[PDB]
Amino acid sequence: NADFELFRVFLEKTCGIVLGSNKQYLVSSRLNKLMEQQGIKSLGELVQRIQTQRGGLREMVVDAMTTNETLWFRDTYPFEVLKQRVLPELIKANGGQRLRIWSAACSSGQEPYSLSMAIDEFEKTNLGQLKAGVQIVATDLSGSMLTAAKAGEYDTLAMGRGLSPERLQRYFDAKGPGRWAVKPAIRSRVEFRALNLLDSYASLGKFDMVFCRNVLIYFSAEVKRDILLRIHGTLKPGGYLFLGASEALNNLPDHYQMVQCSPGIIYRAK
Structure with missing residues (x-):
């Protein structure tokens, strides 16, 4: 060893x-x-x-240090952190003034739809805190994966990966013998917009939270920092960034504060 x-x-x-x-x-x-x-x-x-x-x-x-797989509620911890830590922290601060979430590199749609579900179940538990609506913006390369996201259907097999049978029955209509579609209530919380992370983020506006997980590791060091610096923009002061399992941002003159929770870490923008 x-x-x-x-x-x-x-x-x-x-x-x-x-x-x-x-x-x-x-x-x-x-x-x-x-x-x-x-x-x-x-x-x-x-x-x-x-x-x-x-x-x-x-x-x-x-590769192979990361599952080259698209899961539902990846790692499970960042979504629990979102619900019982981040959103309450953000709810007090803002006074429920419409939180915006960025699902950067959304792929097949799974990650942001998982977020939309996490919201619904937070709204269900913490009634009256769901002031306004949270706007989830999910951005990706114009392609088949983003187009597949917009459709929001999913293989019956893809559903077996990281998704509770509760959440499946609750948040999904079966639109086929072997197919499953996202329920419109969950569907409607997200808007998909085509974006290359190498381009300008000015059109997106500011976010209370950003979810960019297992993305930057596939880039270099010089351009990873660049994207991180542009992600510091489009972030409300004290906004949170989720980098996924075992990603570190060792860089940037502070700017981002490392926040250790018990199950993992998130980053707040200074």
Whole structure:
């Protein structure tokens, strides 16, 4: 168990991905499949990654550290954090003045629809706090995935991934033998707009919260910081940013305050 700290310290220092003495199996399982696609023996890879900008092995290592899967309520913790921590913090501050949420890189639609559900169930528990309506804006590359999001249908198999059978029955109409559609009440809370994260965010306006998870890690360091700096814009002061499981923003002169919750961390904009 000694030749792991060498690896994880590498990732944090360079790729900006943090790990843990526990999750050492969901790692050594996934990259060992890629490592078998070569002659690297756990630490010969560490040195061979430093020849970056050559043959993309570095960018491949980034993969399989992340499930290349689209889940419902990914990691489960940021959505509980949203409900019982962030929204109450934000409700007092604002006086329920229509919170805006950004689902940056929404993909198939799953992440923002999960958010829309989280809102509904917060409104259900904390009645009368649901002043106005929260506006969720989900942005992505003009393509089949965003277009699939707008449709808001979903494979019966895709529903088995990260979604409670309660939430399925409650928030979904079955629109087919093998298909499922988002219920209009949940559907209506989000607006999809096509955007490349490399372009200007001025047209989007300001947000109380931003959800950008498992996105920036697939970028470089110089452009990751750039997007982070532009994400600091379009954020109300004291607004929150969700970066997903094991992403770190080690950079930016402060600006973003690291907020440790018990299950994970979020970032507040200073």
